[PDB]
């Protein structure tokens, strides 16, 4: 029933799993996330993440469409990302072109703090670390991004808009009351036709909260209040890979 | 148009949701004090039990310090924190003289509580058998603390038993999702002796040994022994200069790699295993060994 | 040979069953819910011109006498007396002076029986806790038929939480929920058995324990047979006082069942427990002597889903009866009755009436509020948790009419068309008793609490204590389209 | 959508109607039964003395009871069934006792003595 | 937009107005408001308000209520009152009679912490400290109960629902854009048809939320976050209200 999440109630309820941040940073959040959201033009403006760097200086992501239509069977969604080092500034995220996304996805290891470092990788080449970033939270987010199930419907001129009728998902426990955001609302696509093992769902019945981590990252948290129709979700941690997921399981 | 989600029609609470209740129930009743219950059969009030006295720190002074960086749990938590630690050094049954919170461990089902408390009548343990490493006994390097786990703040709290060498060398090989209940096969191969309450002792033992820290200077070591006394001409360090590595040191004596804090040697030709060679025991955290290069 | 007491009662041909080869069962189980604290029960004392015409001892006690079977023995021993004396006059020869011998023994006879009536009567008196309002319901809901018991009350969710899954001082005794229901239960049942009959009543219990608790988990397996044998000991101490529990012969009467309910499944097993319960239930045999005779007749189990009711059956454990909740519009457990059909054990119904939710009223009204509360039915909210897993209060005014229709058809009560059809599906019934001029309201009947107008028929009817059914095929269709 | 607002109006009207005359039906039958109930009481004296069937008292008993109070009475009001009983078991020719085991083997019904033939 | 209001949202927009709960009574409320909620048949209960007593336990009360109703005229919403001294034991708020009630008025000045006390008053007259308490909730609740108008709507079987399809209050910085909750949705009558001078409102454009302070009672706050689309209404002080008003303004 909601039309975007909040920034308290996500820091609320994830709290639990580590996915904080400091009380500064958050009133800073409180006075600057509007400031951007003007200064930029974009209807809908939230927290994204927070990345770790080898500082104590982490990202903190923000990303925030303007339009989202459907095109070709994927609901697309144009979005912008914004990245600070503290609550109070932010910049942009530009685009990666293809050749220097293939060369990002090489570079592991957690960030550095200052976003000017160049990466130097085998002739040389040298890529800057806002790509690197960049290319880590869109890995994330195609991997990643969660809403529930017949929580954005189709209109005329095909663009995705919330569905002011939700009212809610039924077994919350299930991984099938849940689809990722780029899912045409039609499609009967859900988590459940991802891998067997790389989502954890726990749901508490007495409060009606269900929690869904990500293991293949395992630093992405998603909930669901069911009492009041509330969902989001925050990226917490290094942007690296878990690539051998079939070991840990 | 209908829309798809028009209406749902659901009890107010699930009928399958007792053990989410009774959760619910026992953190709760870590607020306030509990109330008097008359017995059944009469009016007669049933007498509370006698508190034990024990030792504990500021919960909410180092949960606020960790709100401030903002790492750790909430706020909301540290404060069930404290509670917990009280009750659990409130109990009579269970004789503590220190509690501290060790943390918090995800799982893939439920997630663990720790607590590390020393007691006023270690249990006993049983010898080593013959051909395997000595076990540590109870106060020493490794098993210096026994550790309490909950799945939920307050509720049931079970006791880990000791860790062993074997357990601690077999825990290096592996790597693996907490399932998040205290009975499940941490592995077939490696070979590791024990459940996942071994496993979890055993990554306790090496989280420890590994990332407790005490501000430098704020302890002297002992000359001969290992034990550490608190030195009275401290002064502190103010403001960001605890941010820098250098100002920190370990509390805890660093854990060899045989599985011990302290080498056992056999009696005579000994292995390179036997005499490893540690780091003084206040170690700093700048003298640390890196983490291996990266790709970029 | 059909049961007397619903021969009389209702032209009923049905033949008495057992639930276990000592105990009787009736045809309709009455889950008993106290209206008020077992304390404010246990403390009413029905103790209060030269004539009072409304004073309670010309009134109460003249019916509940003529009931025991000491006066019931007086009157026969009379007509016998009259009978013999009129042969003894009419012979007036050698076997007159047997006859008369007979007279003389029937004499004797009369003279301890009548002892026995003025003993009866004065035990009438000398004890406050008879003929109050709970104790002349239980004992009317008793002589109408249904003398099967079990011991319930507000429970999850709807009740304190504190009282089910909170730690108790170590101080405490071990006493766990539904505790005062047992003994206000064992007070009716001593009172009744003194009153007439050694074994009338029977008392189905239900075993709560608590798994979440501290001493549950860190305990184990010896852990919860401790708790088991002394939860056994304890209801042995509530439904027996602390004298008579033992037979005159030195082994202990063991109790009638035991209900087991499991409150989480994949926290703990019920598995020990069972085994415990088993053998308590079983007499361990030596050479033959039988040693450590048997404390529980019988074990149940309450809401256990069919898988866990199946691999409970592969344990060895004797499971005699399971009671589910399963009405005429709630349908949710069917394969349960196909495994207890199968493996031929007593399966019971609780719901049926939606809580009181199928009378006559509801039919056009609004739904019921918890805040303003209502009275009639046992439990509002678990009332709406009903009505939203039917659908909406739409399907139940829906449904209501259609039941209402196929009533007015036979000419019954709303109610007893929903019972009938749980007894038709096999199950056995479980209506809650209720209370303070509200008596036999379960059952649909109105106005029922006094003597003037009920004149002591039972609150019930007759087609539904019957062995074949009223419905017609019409109606078996609607009700299930009614789904 | 004026029409859809009257007819709303009226169903809820409506339902409000039904809950009302439920609770009056309810309070006609308290009344009328505590109407049975009142004449029941007063009615009991007169079957005690009179017209139990195994009789506590015999009829020329109570007669004579009767008309002595009648007597004691005009030397001073009207006789009383209730009266009459009063008096008599204060005169101790009828105990309580008796009473209540006339009663119990009346409300025996067919299965008392009485009722059988014999 | 929101079905219930949230606790937290309420706290952390009126932490200016100076409406604060303290640490142990927030954590407790949040663990214990459901445990009470679903012990009742409750499918609403929230924090009312916390009055201030004499000896330090400050009473905190929460009300609660399954349906919305309109009869005669009105939306009547049957509610039900909770109080406490610590935020985990929730006992109920006996309501209270006419004659007692005032009475009731009588008595001034901070009622103490000790539900056992008894107040004097004039023969002789007796009165509960509970029920002073439950006289002046419900004096204060009558007085002032604060929802953005139209932000609920009738329906089938007349019952007041909130209303899914609520496209904000337009001007939301005068009282005509909030209600009572017992003023009809459909009728006119608003936050402006009572005392000129009894309601403050203060608005931030910018950050888009409006915050309304009653000076009949200088102890109710109220918010509406108009971007989030979220209301809440708080109640912290002693239920005294002012009389000596008209001098103030």
């Known amino acids: 029933v909601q039309l975007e999440p909040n920034i308290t109630l996500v820091l609320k309820h994830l709290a639990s799993c580590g996915a904080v941040v400091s009380a500064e940073q958050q009133a800073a959040l409180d006075h600057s996330i509007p400031i951007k959201r003007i200064e930029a033009g974009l209807r809908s403006l939230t927290l994204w993440g927070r990345l770790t760097t080898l500082n104590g200086k ?73 790509a690197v970033l960049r290319c880590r939270v869109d890995a994330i987010a195609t991997a990643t991004s969660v809403i529930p199930t017949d929580s954005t419907i189709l209109n005329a001129a095909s663009q995705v808009v919330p569905n002011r009728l939700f009212a809610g998902a039924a077994y919350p426990e299930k991984l099938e009351s849940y689809q990722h955001r780029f899912s045409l609302p039609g499609s009967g696509v859900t988590l459940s036709q991802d ?39 925050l990226y917490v941690g290094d942007g690296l890979r878990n690539n051998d997921l079939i070991f840990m399981l | 148009s209908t829309p798809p989600a028009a209406n749902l029609s659901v009890p107010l609470v699930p009928a399958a949701s007792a053990a989410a209740a009774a959760a619910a129930v026992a953190k709760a009743s870590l607020f306030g004090d509990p109330e008097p219950v008359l017995d059944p059969e009469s009016g007669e009030p049933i007498d509370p039990d006698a508190p034990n006295e024990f030792e504990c720190e500021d919960v909410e002074g180092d949960g606020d310090l960790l709100d401030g960086l903002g790492v750790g749990l909430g706020r909301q938590e540290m404060y069930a924190a404290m509670l917990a630690v009280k009750r659990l050094g409130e109990d009579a049954k269970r004789g503590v003289s220190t509690v501290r919170f060790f943390g918090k461990f995800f799982g893939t089902q439920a997630d663990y509580y720790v607590f590390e408390t020393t007691l006023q009548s270690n249990p006993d343990m049983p010898e080593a058998p013959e051909g395997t490493i000595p076990l540590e006994p109870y106060g020493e390097g490794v098993n210096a603390y026994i550790y309490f786990v909950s799945n939920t703040l307050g509720g049931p709290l079970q006791q880990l038993p000791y860790v062993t060498p074997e357990q601690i060398k077999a825990s290096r090989l592996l790597r693996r999702y907490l399932t998040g209940r205290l009975d ?71 854990l060899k790699g045989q599985g011990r804090t302290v080498t056992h040697k056999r009696d005579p030709f000994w292995t390179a295993e036997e005499m490893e060679a540690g780091p003084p025991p206040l170690a700093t955290l700048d003298t640390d060994a890196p983490l291996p290069a990266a790709t970029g | 040979a059909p049961d007397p007491v619903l021969n009389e009662l209702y032209g009923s041909e049905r033949p008495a069953v057992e639930l276990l080869p000592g105990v009787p ?34 009134n109460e006690l003249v019916r509940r006498l003529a009931k025991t079977a000491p006066f019931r023995k007086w009157n026969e021993l009379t007509i016998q007396a009259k009978q013999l004396e009129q042969e003894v006059a009419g012979l007036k020869g050698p076997d007159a002076e047997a006859k008369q011998a007979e007279l003389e023994n029937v004499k004797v006879q009369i003279a301890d029986a009548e002892a026995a009536v003025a003993e009866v009567k004065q035990s009438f008196s000398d004890d406050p806790l008879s003929l109050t309002g709970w104790m002349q319901a239980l004992t009317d809901l008793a002589d109408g ?49 003194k009153e007439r009959g050694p074994g009338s009543v029977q008392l189905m219990l239900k075993l709560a324990p608590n798994v979440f608790s501290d001493a549950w988990s860190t305990g184990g397996a010896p852990a919860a047979v401790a708790a088991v044998e002394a939860y056994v000991e304890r209801a042995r ?48 045999l030596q050479v033959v002597s039988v040693s450590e005779p048997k404390k529980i007749r019988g074990i149940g189990l309450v809401d256990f889903p069919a898988d866990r009711l199946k691999a409970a059956i592969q344990a060895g454990v004797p499971i005699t009866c399971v009671q589910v909740e399963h009405s005429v519009l709630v349908r949710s457990a069917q394969p349960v009755l196909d495994l207890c059909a199968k493996y031929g054990i007593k399966v019971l119904a609780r719901g049926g ?80 008793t209720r209370w303070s001029s509200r008596v036999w309201r379960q059952f649909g009947y109105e106005g029922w609490s006094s003597f003037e107008v009920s004149g002591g028929r039972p609150g019930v009817d007759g087609p539904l204590f019957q062995v074949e059914s009223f419905l017609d095929v019409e109606d078996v269709r609607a009700l299930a389209g009614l789904a | 959508l004026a029409a859809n607002r009257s007819t709303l109006a009226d169903k809820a009207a409506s339902t409000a109607a039904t809950v009302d005359a439920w609770a009056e039906r309810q309070a006609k039958m308290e009344a009328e039964l505590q109407g049975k109930e009142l004449e029941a009481v007063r009615r009991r004296p007169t079957f005690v003395l009179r017209e139990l069937k195994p009789a506590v008292a015999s009829a ?54 009485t009722n059988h033939p014999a």
């Open chain 3, 145 to 193: 038929g249904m003398t099967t018991f079990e011991v319930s009350g507000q429970g999850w969710p709807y009740c304190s939480l504190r009282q089910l899954f909170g730690e108790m001082p170590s101080a405490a005794p071990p006493a766990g929920f539904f505790d005062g229901v047992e003994r206000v239960l064992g007070t009716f049942k001593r009172r009744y058995e």
């Open chain 3, 237 to 284: 101490a509530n439904v027996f006082g602390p004298d008579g529990g033992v037979t005159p012969e030195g082994v202990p009467e063991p109790l009638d069942l035991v209900q087991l309910v499991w409150w989480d499944f994949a926290a703990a097993d019920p598995l020990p427990v069972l085994k415990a319960l088993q053998r308590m239930a079983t007499d361990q």
């Open chain 3, 353 to 432: 009436t939606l809580g009181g939710l199928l009378s006559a009223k509801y039919l056009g009204a609004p739904p019921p509020d918890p805040v303003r509360g209502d009275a009639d039915l046992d439990s509002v909210p678990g009332c709406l948790d009903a009505v939203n897993n039917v659908g909406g209060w739409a399907r139940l005014q829906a449904a209501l009419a259609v039941i209402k229709g196929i009533a007015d058809k036979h000419g019954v009560k709303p109610e007893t068309v929903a019972l009938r059809w749980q007894i038709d599906a096999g199950c056995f019934p479980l209506v809650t």
């Open chain 2, 184 to 254: 499940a096969p941490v592995s077939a191969f490696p070979a590791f002796p024990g459940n996942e309450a071994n496993y979890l002792r055993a990554l306790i033992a090496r989280i420890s040994a590994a990332t407790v820290c005490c501000p430098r200077g704020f302890f002297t070591a002992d000359d001969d022994s290992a034990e550490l006394s608190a030195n009275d001409e401290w002064v502190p360090l103010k403001g960001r200069e605890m941010a820098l590595p250098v100002n920190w040191s370990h509390r805890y004596a660093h």
């Open chain 3, 25 to 58: 069962l009736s045809p309709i189980v009455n889950s008993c819910w106290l209206p008020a604290d077992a304390k404010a029960m246990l403390a009413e004392s029905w103790i209060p011109p030269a004539f009072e015409a409304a004073a309670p001892e010309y």
């Open chain 1, 58 to 130: 982490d990202y903190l992501v923000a990303e925030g469409y303007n339009v989202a239509s459907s095109k070709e069977g994927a609901a697309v969604y144009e979005t912008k990302y914004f990245y600070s080092q503290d609550g109070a500034r932010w910049s942009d995220l530009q685009p990666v072109d293809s050749e220097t996304a293939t060369r990002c996805a090489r570079i592991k290891g957690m960030l550095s703090g200052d976003p000017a470092k160049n990466y130097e990788l085998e002739l040389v080449f040298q890529i800057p670390e806002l």
């Open chain 1, 195 to 233: 891998l067997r093992g790389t989502w954890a769902v726990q749901y508490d019945a007495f409060k009606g909260v269900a929690q869904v981590r990500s293991l293949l990252f395992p630093g992405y948290f998603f909930y669901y209040a069911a009492n009041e129709l509330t969902w989001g979700s």
């Open chain 4, 60 to 113: 020329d008993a109570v007669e004579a009871a009767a008309a002595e109070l009648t007597a004691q009475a005009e030397e001073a009001k009207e006789v009383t069934d209730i009266d009459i009983l009063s008096y008599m078991m204060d005169k101790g020719a009828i105990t309580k006792d008796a009473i209540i085991q006339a009663l119990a083997v009346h409300a025996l019904g067919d299965k008392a003595y």
